[PDB]
Amino acid sequence: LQYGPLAYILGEKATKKMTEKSKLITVDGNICSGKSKLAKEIAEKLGLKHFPEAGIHYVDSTTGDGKPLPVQFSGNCSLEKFYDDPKSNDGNSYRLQAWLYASRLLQYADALEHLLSTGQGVVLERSIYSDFVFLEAMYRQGFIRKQCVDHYNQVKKVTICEYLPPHVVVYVDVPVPEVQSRIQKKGNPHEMKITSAYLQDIENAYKGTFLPEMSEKCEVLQYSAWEAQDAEKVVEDIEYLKYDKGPWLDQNDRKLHKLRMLVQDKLEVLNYTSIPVFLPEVTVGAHQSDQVFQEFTELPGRKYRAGYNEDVGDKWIWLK
Amino acid sequence: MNPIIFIIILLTIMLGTIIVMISSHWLLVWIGFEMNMLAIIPIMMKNHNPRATEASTKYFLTQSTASMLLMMAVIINLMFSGQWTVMKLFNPMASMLMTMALAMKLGMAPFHFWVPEVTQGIPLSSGLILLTWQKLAPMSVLYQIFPSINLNLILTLSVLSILIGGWGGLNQTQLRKIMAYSSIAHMGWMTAVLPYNPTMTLLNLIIYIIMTSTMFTMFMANSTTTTLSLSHTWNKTPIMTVLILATLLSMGGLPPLSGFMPKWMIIQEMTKNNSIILPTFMAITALLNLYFYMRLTYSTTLTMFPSTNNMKMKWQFPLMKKMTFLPTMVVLSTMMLPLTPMLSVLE
Amino acid sequence: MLKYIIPTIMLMPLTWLSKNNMIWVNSTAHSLLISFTSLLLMNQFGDNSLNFSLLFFSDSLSTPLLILTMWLLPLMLMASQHHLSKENLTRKKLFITMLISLQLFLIMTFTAMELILFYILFEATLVPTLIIITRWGNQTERLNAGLYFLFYTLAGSLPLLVALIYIQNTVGSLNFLMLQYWVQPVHNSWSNVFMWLACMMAFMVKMPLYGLHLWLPKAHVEAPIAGSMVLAAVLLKLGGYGMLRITLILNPMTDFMAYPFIMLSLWGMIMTSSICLRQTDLKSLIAYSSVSHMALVIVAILIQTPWSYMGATALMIAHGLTSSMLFCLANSNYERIHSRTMILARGLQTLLPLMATWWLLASLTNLALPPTINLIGELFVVMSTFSWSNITIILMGVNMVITALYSLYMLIMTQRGKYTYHINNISPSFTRENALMSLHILPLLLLTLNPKIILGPLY
Amino acid sequence: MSMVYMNIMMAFTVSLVGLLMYRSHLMSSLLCLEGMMLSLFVMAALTILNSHFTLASMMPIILLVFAACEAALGLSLLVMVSNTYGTDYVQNLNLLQC
Amino acid sequence: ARQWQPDVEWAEQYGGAVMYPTKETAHWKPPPWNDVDPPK
Amino acid sequence: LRWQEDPEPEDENLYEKNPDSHGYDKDPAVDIWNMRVVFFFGFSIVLVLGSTFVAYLPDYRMQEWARREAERLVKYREAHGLPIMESNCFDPSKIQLPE
Numbered sequence A: 001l002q003y004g005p006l007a008y009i010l011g012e013k014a015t016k017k018m019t020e021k022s023k024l025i026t027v028d029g030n031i032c033s034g035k036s037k038l039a040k041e042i043a044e045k046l047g048l049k050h051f052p053e054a055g056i057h058y059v060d061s062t063t064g065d066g067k068p069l070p071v072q073f074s075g076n077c078s079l080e081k082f083y084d085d086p087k088s089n090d091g092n093s094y095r096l097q098a099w100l101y102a103s104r105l106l107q108y109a110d111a112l113e114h115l116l117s118t119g120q121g122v123v124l125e126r127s128i129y130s131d132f133v134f135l136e137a138m139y140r141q142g143f144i145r146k147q148c149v150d151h152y153n154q155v156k157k158v159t160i161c162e163y164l165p166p167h168v169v170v171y172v173d174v175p176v177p178e179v180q181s182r183i184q185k186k187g188n189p190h191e192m193k194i195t196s197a198y199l200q201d202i203e204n205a206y207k208g209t210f211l212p213e214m215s216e217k218c219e220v221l222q223y224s225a226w227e228a229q230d231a232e233k234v235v236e237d238i239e240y241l242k243y244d245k246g247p248w249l250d251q252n253d254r255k256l257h258k259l260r261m262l263v264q265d266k267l268e269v270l271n272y273t274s275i276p277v278f279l280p281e282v283t284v285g286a287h288q289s290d291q292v293f294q295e296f297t298e299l300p301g302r303k304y305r306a307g308y309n310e311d312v313g314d315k316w317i318w319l320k
Numbered sequence B: 001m002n003p004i005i006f007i008i009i010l011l012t013i014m015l016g017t018i019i020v021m022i023s024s025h026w027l028l029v030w031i032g033f034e035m036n037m038l039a040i041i042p043i044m045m046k047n048h049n050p051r052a053t054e055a056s057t058k059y060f061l062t063q064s065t066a067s068m069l070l071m072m073a074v075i076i077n078l079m080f081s082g083q084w085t086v087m088k089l090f091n092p093m094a095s096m097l098m099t100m101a102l103a104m105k106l107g108m109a110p111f112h113f114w115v116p117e118v119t120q121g122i123p124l125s126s127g128l129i130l131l132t133w134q135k136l137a138p139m140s141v142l143y144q145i146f147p148s149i150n151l152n153l154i155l156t157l158s159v160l161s162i163l164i165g166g167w168g169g170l171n172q173t174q175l176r177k178i179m180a181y182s183s184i185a186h187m188g189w190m191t192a193v194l195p196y197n198p199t200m201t202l203l204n205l206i207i208y209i210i211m212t213s214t215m216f217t218m219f220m221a222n223s224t225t226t227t228l229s230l231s232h233t234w235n236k237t238p239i240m241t242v243l244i245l246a247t248l249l250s251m252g253g254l255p256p257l258s259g260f261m262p263k264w265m266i267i268q269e270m271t272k273n274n275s276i277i278l279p280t281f282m283a284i285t286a287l288l289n290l291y292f293y294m295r296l297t298y299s300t301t302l303t304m305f306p307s308t309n310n311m312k313m314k315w316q317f318p319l320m321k322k323m324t325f326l327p328t329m330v331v332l333s334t335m336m337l338p339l340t341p342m343l344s345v346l347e
Numbered sequence C: 001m002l003k004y005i006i007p008t009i010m011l012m013p014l015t016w017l018s019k020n021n022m023i024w025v026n027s028t029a030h031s032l033l034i035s036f037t038s039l040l041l042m043n044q045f046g047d048n049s050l051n052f053s054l055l056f057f058s059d060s061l062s063t064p065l066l067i068l069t070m071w072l073l074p075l076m077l078m079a080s081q082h083h084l085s086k087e088n089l090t091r092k093k094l095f096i097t098m099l100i101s102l103q104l105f106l107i108m109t110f111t112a113m114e115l116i117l118f119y120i121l122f123e124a125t126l127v128p129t130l131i132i133i134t135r136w137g138n139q140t141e142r143l144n145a146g147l148y149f150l151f152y153t154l155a156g157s158l159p160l161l162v163a164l165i166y167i168q169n170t171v172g173s174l175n176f177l178m179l180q181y182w183v184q185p186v187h188n189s190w191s192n193v194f195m196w197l198a199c200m201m202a203f204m205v206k207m208p209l210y211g212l213h214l215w216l217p218k219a220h221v222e223a224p225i226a227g228s229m230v231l232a233a234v235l236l237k238l239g240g241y242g243m244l245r246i247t248l249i250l251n252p253m254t255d256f257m258a259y260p261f262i263m264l265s266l267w268g269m270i271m272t273s274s275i276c277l278r279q280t281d282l283k284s285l286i287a288y289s290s291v292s293h294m295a296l297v298i299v300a301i302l303i304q305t306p307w308s309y310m311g312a313t314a315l316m317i318a319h320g321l322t323s324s325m326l327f328c329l330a331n332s333n334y335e336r337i338h339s340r341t342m343i344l345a346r347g348l349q350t351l352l353p354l355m356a357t358w359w360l361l362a363s364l365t366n367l368a369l370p371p372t373i374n375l376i377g378e379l380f381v382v383m384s385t386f387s388w389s390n391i392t393i394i395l396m397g398v399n400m401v402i403t404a405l406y407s408l409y410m411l412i413m414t415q416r417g418k419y420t421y422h423i424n425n426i427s428p429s430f431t432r433e434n435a436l437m438s439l440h441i442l443p444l445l446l447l448t449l450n451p452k453i454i455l456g457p458l459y
Numbered sequence D: 001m002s003m004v005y006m007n008i009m010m011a012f013t014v015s016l017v018g019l020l021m022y023r024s025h026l027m028s029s030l031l032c033l034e035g036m037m038l039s040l041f042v043m044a045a046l047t048i049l050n051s052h053f054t055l056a057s058m059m060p061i062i063l064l065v066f067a068a069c070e071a072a073l074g075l076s077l078l079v080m081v082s083n084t085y086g087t088d089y090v091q092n093l094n095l096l097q098c
Numbered sequence E: 001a002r003q004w005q006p007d008v009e010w011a012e013q014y015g016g017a018v019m020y021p022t023k024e025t026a027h028w029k030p031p032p033w034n035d036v037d038p039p040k
Numbered sequence F: 001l002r003w004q005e006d007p008e009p010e011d012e013n014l015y016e017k018n019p020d021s022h023g024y025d026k027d028p029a030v031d032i033w034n035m036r037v038v039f040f041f042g043f044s045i046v047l048v049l050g051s052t053f054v055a056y057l058p059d060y061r062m063q064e065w066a067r068r069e070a071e072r073l074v075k076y077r078e079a080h081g082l083p084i085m086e087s088n089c090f091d092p093s094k095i096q097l098p099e
């Protein structure tokens, strides 16, 4: 029985599988701040599904066979190419950011769908709420134009409002001089080109806008570089939180029915990520968009709806 | 809304219309409109934003005003006849008030100003109920009182509706405003043939409802409310572009499509009554409707508008919306012309 | 007519159920077979036409138009293979489906026995034609061309719908056989003056009549090659065919209502033929030549004489094969230089010797060299108009002089002289292109050996 | 008919003309809408009571019940407008086709 | 020459509040994408 | 740039990869068969047999019969002193004039 009004009427309600342990945790932080390690530990010490940070190819992992698709089907946006030539004239800087916001928006919907359907909590590296720190980091370095920020805010103000903020925000703070050092140790040829001004702007966005804005509706835990290494301390603090603010208190089976209907319809989630604002960075011509679409339908298991592809081993199509 | 409450409200919208259609007493006709209006407001405000509040408020003020004129017609008809039976009215003043009351409920010109703004301010699902189901009750009453309707008045509302609806839609880019004006234009066709053959009012109403339902359903499938948001459809659901082309040509009255049948039969009936100037004027003026239908075909199916990079993420997910009866409606709305003499089942 | 309607419908499953690389081969081969069987309609009698059933009938007028219509579908498929090679397979098969729908509507249009059935099919040819122009045209102006082609035809067709329905209410029937016997004279009154305009304006706009022709230089030029061929070869002849039928029920009011249109056409001949002398676009020069050739048809139909009717039918068939050939010849250049300007590529006779032979023959037919059926039709129309008014020979004579000037100017400007130095992509003519021209000109000349089968009912 | 019908029927016209000519306040217009019902209630009651149409005597009560239910919906919409804009002025309801 | 398809200049003609600009409607702006006007 | 659009593709010379190309298709096997169907059904069937079919039509619109019939009437009428052709098409014995 696929979820819908009939399932909700027959008993499938959100406040029958959610418990005190059904929480949504996002582990924010700067580059090389150790969040990926901390978040992976919080999830396993609380029985929570873990979501690795949404990258360029996140959507591919959740659809089809799970393997990444050729980059042409992601818009050719590259994180490696962003570091080398952040001032590129082909708009790869903003077209990267716009694609990443959609990926996080898609991931956040998948997380909420898991929390509501199964009742199990989830841990995210970053979220649509914190994703703007990179945008104003790009803008303040001159990597993107103002029209790119205006377009970004238009997409955010029509998509963010439809969802609920995380229960707990975990911020791992690492000063910029230390972050530069940790970037060098991993020694990624493209990442090492990151400038300290870019890293500093991320913190200013994190410090000035994200934390003071999420603290009035979420539980905020601001650890440091040394404190973050103590996972048992983090799990202990989270389990002692009070949860006395934010919109998750003013929710019922009726409101969560609407939320689940939206988050299971992925085309509905991504509806305004492609609004007809003709920004050069994200606009694609009709000839190139047409050519790529035809190539996409020729990939294995993509021509038809899932379960109707006879070239990947689907049978009973004539009775299905 | 709670899903059960949503169904209870829809059944009350339908019950009020059914009460109007099965009633022999003028009081029960008025009650049906009152019940129908009471249960339509909540679905017009299911989104809870300022634009829906304004749309419901304008809808409430117009329908309440019409409902009071309808009562005044009934009481005047009671004073001069002493009976409540739903039939021809027994007083010229009662006829005019009832006709103008039903013209306001239908949104016919010059009482049309609410239709475009109310439709724009409510979701596509509620616009569909507004422009298709809400016209069944006022047309049911007009079908019964037409022997005593002033001929000049009813034909004047028809001509104005065709003109205003035709001219209004030319200046529109919002789809819900385009459909609202297309509705006013077709209301004039239904009521222009009413004195001559009310069976061609049902034919035009039924074909229009099918075509309008098909259009809204395909706008809901892709969650499109603007011309430019509808011009991205070729890069997501190419099939939905060809179906929109076929349904838009049919709405324009182009043969060999179904939407030609109403225009064809209305002209046949009016010329039988030696009405030549009016059908010619209506047919030519209906080309205004065809023009702004053809614009949507250009930007949706017959050209490939610029796309967006984030569109590539939509190629990976299917359409999960119900699209109920869409395969059946699109065929009925385009391929029914060979079965035209079936219209006599409405007799 | 079910022996032709059904096979045409079956060309759609054939295209959609065929191998991806055989769509052109399969559709071309079976459209040539349907053309072959169309010759059975030649079973004509000297007194009675072929009256198949209550719906469809064929006489000596519709039969040549049916044969021409079914012959052009294979030629349209050949002419479109090149520019549609880099096209999505589903969209290649939708282009062919529009061509098949157009033939399906045309064959039912020319044989419809009831006028209202003729009207619906006559009007249904707009949709596939509109879609071909706006979807598979190349330039920006195809969108505006489609709107002009659409609203010019409906501005005249809708009044025709009212007039036809009025006629049935008063006469009782619209069956064309019934009208032959129940027809009554048209009394001279203001009411009948407008029944005449409503019954003829739709067909004159589609001919087109000079003054209402502005849609033709747009649509015929902006359409793809297949669109241009059908537009100029079969769809201009819906207006001429309609007037031949509808004029039965407009007597005697036609003998004075015809003056404003005989004057527009006679003087429109000279204006449109003169425009061609100064056209920069090669495809546009050919488009205006159709306006000047259909001017004679309008005059012939309106003066209502056996010789004018025989000339009108020969002209429509002769013009169908010649204008269609010229568009294909022009498109042959365009597919190499990708420009419609006439003065861009010159001296092409030194680079494409055999294609210059087709240009010559297409130019000689266009200027009505005897004894081609182009001259037979044109001559028969000059003879009839001379009896109508001896002064008309002046206007007919002047148009002949202008016709030769712009026919050979097109030949000289594009084929002779020095070749353009910087154009070095003029590849040798393909076998597809040469065979396409041979399929136009050979039937056009073989008809000279048996002209009677295109001379119409009055023969 | 009787000069009582002259004034009651003129009361309906005054309320109708009052309703169709908004000043500023939505609440003032909702009163004109409810004044039309009162004029209809009195007009309907006089006709029924005078003609001794016994069974119709329940009709004026049904008219009062539905129009009051309709009025309740009107106040609810007015209250929602006030929350949005702080005042019930009809001049703030022009977001649609401004 | 490849087939012409609308560019951004062409498509922007169908993006304003109205198709035919005038002095009176120059003040109009396109509605919100989600039909929601910010509270205030 | 104003957008990310593909470059205008350069036209492809069909003779480069196939100097025996008939112009119908890129695949030589399909190219040859498309040429064969057009030439056989176009020239061998329709133009040759169609021309032969038309040349032997059974007296298209009865013009040989008309000449044959007129020969009898001219022979008969002249052999009996009758006019070769009468100026009245319908015998006036059954026509009633207005007044």
Ligand SMILES: CCCCCCCCCCCCCCCCCC(=O)OC[C@H](COP(=O)([O-])OCC(O)COP(=O)([O-])OC[C@@H](COC(=O)CCCCCCCCCCCCCCCCC)OC(=O)CCCCCCCCCCCCCCCCC)OC(=O)CCCCCCCCCCCCCCCCC
Pocket (backbone or CB within 6 Å): B234, B238, B239, B241, B242, B243, B245, B246, B249, B256, B257, B301, B302, B334, B335, B336, B337, B338, C009, C012, C013, C016, C090, C091, C094, C097, C098, C101, C104, C127, C128, C131, C135
């Ligand atoms: C008993 C003998 C049987 C034979 C009879 C002859 C057949 C008559 C059928 C008429 C009914 C047609 C509707 C039912 C079939 C629909 C099935 C379908 O949608 O998939 C096709 C299906 C797709 O196959 P596939 O291998 O999966 O490839 C596609 C991929 O799956 C997916 O790849 P994709 O995503 O790229 O594909 C996207 C899209 C391509 O999207 C694009 O991007 C193309 C955009 C530009 C195209 C613009 C041209 C649009 C042409 C349609 C115009 C509509 C107005 C019609 C006006 C009438 C004059 C044309 O491709 C399409 O599928 C579009 C074609 C389907 C359009 C449905 C049209 C419904 C309205 C038709 C109204 C007809 C009214 C007739 C008059 C009334 C009197 C009866 O084809 C088949 O496999 C076999 C089906 C055979 C039917 C072919 C469809 C032709 C329909 C359009 C021609 C209309 C002919 C009208 C003649 C009227 C005079 C009699």
Ligand SMILES: Nc1nc2c(ncn2[C@H]2C[C@H](O)[C@@H](COP(=O)(O)OP(=O)(O)OP(=O)(O)O)O2)c(=O)[nH]1
Pocket (backbone or CB within 6 Å): A029, A030, A031, A032, A033, A034, A035, A036, A037, A053, A079, A082, A096, A097, A100, A131, A134, A135, A191
């Ligand atoms: N332009 C842009 N780059 C982003 C965004 N999110 C991540 N990135 C980039 C910045 C980094 O160089 C790169 C890797 O991010 P991480 O912080 O997760 O790296 P890493 O796992 O090594 O650090 P960690 O220990 O998890 O804290 O991804 C974004 O929203 N916009």
Ligand SMILES: [Mg+2]
Pocket (backbone or CB within 6 Å): A035, A036, A037, A053
């Ligand atoms: Mg990490």
Ligand SMILES: [Zn+2]
Pocket (backbone or CB within 6 Å): C334, C335, C336, C338, E001, F011
């Ligand atoms: Zn080319």
